[PDB]
Ligand binder design. Structure first.
Ligand SMILES: Nc1ncnc2c1ncn2[C@H]1C[C@H](O)[C@@H](COP(=O)(O)O)O1
Ligand SMILES: Nc1ncnc2c1ncn2[C@H]1C[C@H](O)[C@@H](COP(=O)(O)O)O1
Lengths: 103, 103
């Protein structure tokens, strides 16, 4: 009901964590659990490649259909673009429904 | 300079006319040319099939390009459509230049 594709077997969950690295243990055995860990984090790269199937417009409609277009008028910032401070921004939500079909 | 494709061998000219049909000649030979013809016209059907080759957009442009779109707002008549009296009309000229490329 928010939108999209209901799936019984959706793309799986990818889980990740940093393996614990203990700090120096005591020199006499104690069965208590370690609260002492080396503070660390990890970084890396992630790629996602999805293959989307398309359904083409077959319409016989004579007159021009609405399309999603960028405003031609000048502006301080360009839409869907970084600003002077490097911050990416999306000015408006874009739905997918423009082309028209008959019932 | 008006536009389009300069051609040294452009599509040929297709010529058509109605073959003359004389009216009743005199019964005594006269070498004068006939000014007397049966008034007639012809109608028919004509088909033109042209095969146009296309050059696709390869652009890496991030932000959305301008497109030619129909106005969403309501109106008495729809653009590029017949009116109540059956008259087809084109409200505006449409150029071909929307998509953007670099120099
Ligand atoms: N989002 C979504 N996911 C899964 N199943 C759905 C969904 N929406 C509807 N349905 C069900 C009920 C439809 O009549 C049928 C169409 O399946 P068809 O493939 O068109 O034969 O599938
Ligand atoms: N409209 C038109 N018709 C015919 N010849 C033209 C036209 N415009 C330019 N030219 C000539 C001059 C260009 O440098 C060359 C490009 O041919 P190319 O095919 O790109 O190698 O062809």
């Amino acid at each position: 009901l928010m939108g999209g594709f209901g799936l019984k077997h959706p793309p799986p969950q990818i889980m990740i964590k940093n393996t614990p690295v203990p700090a120096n243990p005591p020199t006499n055995f104690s069965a208590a659990k370690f609260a002492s860990f080396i503070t660390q984090y990890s970084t890396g790269q992630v790629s996602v490649e999805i293959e989307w199937e398309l359904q083409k417009e077959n319409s016989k409609r004579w007159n021009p259909e609405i399309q999603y277009t960028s405003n031609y008028n000048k502006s301080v910032n360009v839409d869907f673009t970084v600003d002077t401070n490097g911050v990416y921004s999306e000015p408006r939500p874009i739905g997918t429904r423009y082309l028209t079909r008959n019932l």
